[PDB]
Amino acid sequence: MVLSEGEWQLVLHVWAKVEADVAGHGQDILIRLFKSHPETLEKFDRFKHLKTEAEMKASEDLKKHGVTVLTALGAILKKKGHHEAELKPLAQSHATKHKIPIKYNEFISEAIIHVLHSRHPGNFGADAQGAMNKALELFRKDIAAKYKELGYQG
């Protein structure tokens, strides 16, 4: 798939707001993911022990990882489709080291959309959400194809 330039501008316009507070958005998104789909928490040996939302909110390590996640994702989106080089090491570690099934990428995509909708309603109308969804679908499709190449797929 290909996004038009107008769709990329909608994506990067709301991302510019996210970047005003990377740590806060990273926290909100990962907590959303873990609450909504507790099974994903099990993949993080680092965080598996966190029992409540309050414990998650107080973990500086979780907040650090959320910054890491959003920085990597932002670098990818800013490539506007030309993200082959950035995707390869990400696919390799998630497929081979962390053993993350493809389905869980849909779950974090959902959490990203939820959080932007909650924090940026004026910049995240129907069209901007449609564009962000397309951008994340593009990402998931490309990462899934890499998984298959690397010998995981799934």
Footprint of ligand HEM (CB under 6 A): 40, 43-44, 46, 68-69, 72-73, 90, 93-94, 98, 100, 104-105, 108
Instruction: Choose between 68 and 118: whose C-beta lies nearer to ligand HEM.
Output: 68
| Closest CB 112 distance from ligand HEM, rounded Å | 7
| Closest CB 10 distance from ligand HEM, rounded Å | 19
Closest-CA residue to 71 (of 15, 13, 134): 15
Residues in the chain: 154
Q: Does 94 belong to an annotated binding site?
A: yes
The answer to whether residues 51 and 88 touch, using CB atoms and an 8 Å cutoff, is no
Amino acid at the residue 83: H
Tokens representing residue 15 in the block: 């991302």
Closest-CA residue to 72 (of 26, 103, 124): 26
Instruction: Choose between 16 and 72: whose C-beta lies nearer to ligand HEM.
Output: 72
Tokens representing residue 22 in the block: 């990377």
| Closest CB 142 distance from ligand HEM, rounded Å | 12
The residue to which tokens 């907590």 are assigned? 31
| Closest CB 66 distance from ligand HEM, rounded Å | 10
| Binding-site positions for O2 | 65
| Binding-site positions for nitrite | 65
